[PDB]
Amino acid sequence: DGLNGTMMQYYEWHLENDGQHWNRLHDDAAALSDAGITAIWIPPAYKGNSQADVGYGAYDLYDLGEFNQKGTVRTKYGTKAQLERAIGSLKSNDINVYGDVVMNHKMGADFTEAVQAVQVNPTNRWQDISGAYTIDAWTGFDFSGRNNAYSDFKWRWFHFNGVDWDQRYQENHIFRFANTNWNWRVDEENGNYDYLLGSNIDFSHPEVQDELKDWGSWFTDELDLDGYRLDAIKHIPFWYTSDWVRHQRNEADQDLFVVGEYWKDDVGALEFYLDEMNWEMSLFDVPLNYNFYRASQQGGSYDMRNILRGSLVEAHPMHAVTFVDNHDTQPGESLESWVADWFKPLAYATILTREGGYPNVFYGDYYGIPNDNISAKKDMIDELLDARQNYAYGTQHDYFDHWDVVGWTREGSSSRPNSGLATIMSNGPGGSKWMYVGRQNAGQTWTDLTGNNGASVTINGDGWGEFFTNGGSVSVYVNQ
């Protein structure tokens, strides 16, 4: 229908482990759709190492909070039945469902096995730093409580090629199983970045290749997914992710949107990865996340003309999923690069009102993060979502021509009456800027949807208007 698409990551790292999240998502469906959310990215929905696991310490991909394993039936988010009910609600409310997919490793093995392994250089996994010797690694998975439902596949050490914990001498080291190779090709930071955490899956084995492809199809069909969020893909052999994606699209009738999480503040690396994927998916705009972080951290001295420089959205807008923060970047987490409250509005306006990129709203920003006394930004975000949903249409014009004051416009499209907007912001002292919003909007008087500026901007005969912004603020003018 031409409507702009907006994704929302429906969770934050410190969410309460009350098992009521799927129920919350179910009840929130109508409100989310009305607000402008068109797709929901659910966290890993399968059994993790423990009930409180956020989902990345993935134990059993076939247990969606249905079997008593790892000390619980439900996952941190709820039961399988509640999840399916939530998805049903999202579907009836015209919201796509993307499932987080964790296939890089497994955790919470039921038992250890004796394995010959060598210690490697943490900063160069290609380099062994010890001779081979026997360690006890958590590689045995029997999925007892599942009783082979859906799949009788069992994991053993020979399905993996590394771990970072030896249970025998109880020490942390980056271990490569003797006689096994690190996956390839993978990111090259640390020489070979195949290993990240837990028991690292070795995709050189056909049985592993087929198991995850079959699980993928089972998962897709079980939850009637509309796409996936691929976890830690820079650590998974590129050739396999591509095969896996092609396999799923082949097995599923519905379209499948795919966004990969290749975590690197390097647009070149992300473009190379997309090349390897034949551009068959989009990637989170990690460089842009760091651009926002750099600006938030530096303060007003940050030159706004560079805010989009080096970002994926700047180079391949149609293959970039833009975001401001996520469960990994929030305070105290592994990829911390949190955008402070003062800059956050500007960052969200940037990903929500521009034509390029598939923007994602963070649950933590939307509803807040009580754990860190971070307020819900729903008020501000809803206004930007309103702008995106009803006004961000038509030919765009950019004005990243000042170190403090930058902005852009959208002429709007005939198909969508009254559409059109002018976004202007400043990370330092306030200011103004003449911008072209389209001669077809001549004579209109636009006002700030955010309420941050009371100026009424009347579009002149040539389609130009002078928009104003206060300092460290953002305004989005529309014909309302």
- Stretch near Na ion under the rule CB under 5 A, chosen from 23-31, 101-109, 119-127, 468-476: 101-109
56, two tokens: 């990345």
Q: Examine residue 104 and tell whether it contacts Na ion (CB under 5 A).
A: yes
Beta strand 111-121 with 133-140 is: antiparallel
134, two tokens: 């026997």
Q: Which of 190, 192, 172 is nearest to 182 (CA)?
A: 192
191-230 positions binding Na ion, by CB under 5 A:
194, 200
261 is catalytic: yes
**Nearer to Na ion among residue 404 and residue 448 (C-beta):** 404
Determine which residue in the list 74, 159, 234, 235 makes contact with Na ion, applying CB under 5 A. Answer: 235
Determine which residue in the list 133, 239, 272, 403 makes contact with Na ion, applying CB under 5 A. Answer: 403
d(CA 449, CA 469): 12
| Cβ 68 vs Cβ 75: under 8 Å | no
Nearest residue relative to Na ion (C-beta): 235
| Placement of tokens 């389609």 in the chain | 463
d(CA 152, CA 157): 17
Q: Which of 375, 426, 371 is nearest to 401 (CA)?
A: 426
295-324 positions binding Na ion, by CB under 5 A:
300
Residue 168 CB, shortest distance to Na ion, in Å, is: 23
Q: Examine residue 88 and tell whether it contacts Na ion (CB under 5 A).
A: no
Q: Examine residue 161 and tell whether it contacts Na ion (CB under 5 A).
A: no
- Catalytically annotated residue among 12, 53, 211, 231: 231
Flag whether 202 is marked binding. yes
The b-or-e profile of 89-120 (16+ CB within 10 A means b, else e) is: bbeebebbbbbbbbbbbbbbbbebbebebbbb
Q: Examine residue 291 and tell whether it contacts Na ion (CB under 5 A).
A: no
- Stretch near Na ion under the rule CB under 5 A, chosen from 223-231, 238-246, 286-294, 382-390: 286-294
Residue 425 CB, shortest distance to Na ion, in Å, is: 10
Flag whether 136 is marked binding. no
Beta strand 282-284 with 39-42 is: unpaired
Alpha helices, H only, 306-413: 312-315, 344-352, 363-367, 378-386
231 is catalytic: yes
Q: Where are the beta strands (DSSP E) in 227-359?
A: 227-230, 257-260, 282-284, 320-321
Flag whether 227 is marked binding. no
d(CA 308, CA 312): 9
Residue 302 CB, shortest distance to Na ion, in Å, is: 5
Using CB under 5 A, count the residues that bind Na ion: 15
Residue 330 CB, shortest distance to Na ion, in Å, is: 8
Determine which residue in the list 140, 191, 428, 471 makes contact with Na ion, applying CB under 5 A. Answer: 428
Determine which residue in the list 325, 383, 386, 411 makes contact with Na ion, applying CB under 5 A. Answer: 325
Q: Which of 265, 316, 262, 319 is nearest to 288 (CA)?
A: 265
- Catalytically annotated residue among 66, 100, 211, 261: 261
Q: Examine residue 329 and tell whether it contacts Na ion (CB under 5 A).
A: yes
Determine which residue in the list 211, 231, 285, 404 makes contact with Na ion, applying CB under 5 A. Answer: 404
Q: Residue 305: is the preceding peptide bond cis (ω within 30°)?
A: no
Beta strand 133-140 with 396-399 is: unpaired
Q: What is the largest CA-CA distance in the chain?
A: 80
**Nearer to Na ion among residue 424 and residue 478 (C-beta):** 424
Q: Examine residue 419 and tell whether it contacts Na ion (CB under 5 A).
A: no
The catalytic residues are 231, 261
Annotated binding site for Ca(2+): 104, 194, 202, 235, 300, 404
Given the rule CB under 5 A, which residues bind Na ion? 104, 194, 200, 235, 289, 293, 300, 325, 329, 337, 339, 403-404, 427-428
